[PDB]
Design a protein around this ligand. Structure first.
Ligand SMILES: Nc1ncnc2c1ncn2[C@H]1C[C@H](O)[C@@H](COP(=O)(O)OP(=O)(O)OP(=O)(O)O)O1
Ligand SMILES: [Ca+2]
Ligand SMILES: [Ca+2]
Ligand SMILES: [Ca+2]
Length: 341
DNA sequence: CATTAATCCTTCCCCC
DNA sequence: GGGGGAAGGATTAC
């Protein structure tokens, strides 16, 4: 099997560069203003200019302006990036019909039935990069190996504007010499549980009784990590349908007053129903981020799909339920819709 | 300071 | 005992 993964480079910022090319060369920071005080918010992403100086995603916009007061700061326009992403995906779609659009920025391609070895793969890689560069003026990085996970890892090593092949020989070496923390799916919390069990490389998973590993990190991750270390991992590249749509907003200020929070919530619902576009959910969840950044949520599945007015009144009850069951003030409020017909 | 969504886990619950 | 499905939370990653 030959898997080709494609990840677009500093994507939102690159798109903002593409739409106003003057930005090239300057440090560009795409960020999400939360409407509280001025420059309250976080960084969605930044280009490599900004990222050289520690300005990355998640950091507050205030920390970034301390570091790079004279960088260009731009509000996020996801719908634009979304439309551009769709178009790029369609190019890739003309190199295989076996394609998993994982996210706005990433896609994997099964090209087993197209090319025949890792050289031809490399060629296919360049001519795809070359294409997206021509057609859309966007830099991507390309990673190639025998499964999805190693193809993704390949790309992470290669970025930016890279291409890399991990042939069946280097996989064997990486099972031994790659940090478990650099495996897809192993966030902080998992990585620290694996150091405690004395697992710092992929191979050390074999060392331990399955049933203990299952205890610490769950069966599914255990099996995933085990299969990976045995050169046995091989999930198929499959299309994926969106299962959930929703939206959270930040309030100008924290609150527990029902009437103060309602309008934020109703706005969240309307934006959600527009985004649904002829999709009908049987389930609704109200989510709240509390003053100290804990997350609480309350849901309901219906035997039928949900009208807009039903969502309005049902959300208010669920919000009432959240307030009655947690005494903290609420910072962000929103909805998620799911279980489409 | 701190701005969408998938999948997994645990706990209930109903019931053969 | 165990299937099935719902709720609420935990974790990850973009
Ligand atoms: N923490 C975040 N908050 C909001 N949006 C994010 C966050 N992280 C990533 N994104 C968005 C912005 C990115 O342009 C896009 C893909 O992220 P990702 O591929 O991880 O990095 P990147 O595309 O910014 O640069 P690169 O791929 O070169 O690291 O998703
Ligand atoms: Ca990515
Ligand atoms: Ca990227
Ligand atoms: Ca990781």
């Amino acid at each position: 099997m030959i898997v080709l993964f494609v990840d677009f480079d500093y994507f939102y910022a690159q798109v903002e560069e593409v739409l106003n090319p003057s930005l090239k060369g300057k440090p560009v920071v795409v960020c999400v203003f939360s409407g509280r005080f001025e420059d309250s918010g976080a960084v969605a992403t930044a280009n490599y200019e900004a990222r050289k100086f520690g300005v990355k995603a998640g950091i507050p916009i205030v920390e970034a302006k301390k570091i790079l007061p004279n960088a260009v700061y731009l509000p996020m326009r996801k719908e634009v990036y979304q439309q551009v992403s769709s178009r790029i995906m369609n190019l890739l779609r003309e190199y295989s019909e076996k394609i998993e659009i994982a996210s706005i920025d990433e896609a994997y391609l099964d090209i087993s039935d197209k090319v025949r070895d890792y050289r031809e793969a490399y060629n296919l890689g360049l001519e795809i990069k070359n294409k997206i560069l021509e057609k859309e003026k966007i830099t991507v990085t390309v990673g190639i190996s025998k499964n999805k996970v190693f193809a993704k890892i390949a790309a992470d090593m290669a970025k930016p504007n890279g291409i890399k092949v991990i042939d069946d020989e280097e996989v064997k070496r990486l099972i031994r010499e790659l940090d478990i923390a650099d495996v897809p799916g192993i966030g902080n919390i998992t990585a620290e549980k694996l150091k405690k069990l004395g697992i710092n490389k992929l191979v050390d998973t074999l060392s331990i009784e399955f049933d203990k590993l299952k205890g610490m990190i769950g069966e599914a991750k255990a099996k995933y990590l085990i299969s990976l270390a045995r050169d046995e991992y091989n999930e198929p590249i499959r299309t994926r349908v969106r299962k959930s749509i929703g939206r959270i907003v930040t309030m100008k200020r924290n609150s527990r007053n029902l009437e103060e929070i309602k309008p934020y919530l109703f706005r969240a619902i309307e934006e959600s129903y527009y985004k649904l576009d002829k999709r009908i959910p049987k389930a609704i969840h109200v989510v709240a981020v509390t003053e100290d950044l804990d997350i609480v949520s309350r849901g309901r599945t219906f035997p039928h799909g949900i009208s807009k007015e039903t969502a309005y009144s049902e959300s208010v009850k669920l919000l009432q339920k959240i307030l009655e069951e947690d005494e903290r003030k609420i910072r962000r409020i929103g909805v998620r819709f799911s279980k489409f017909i």
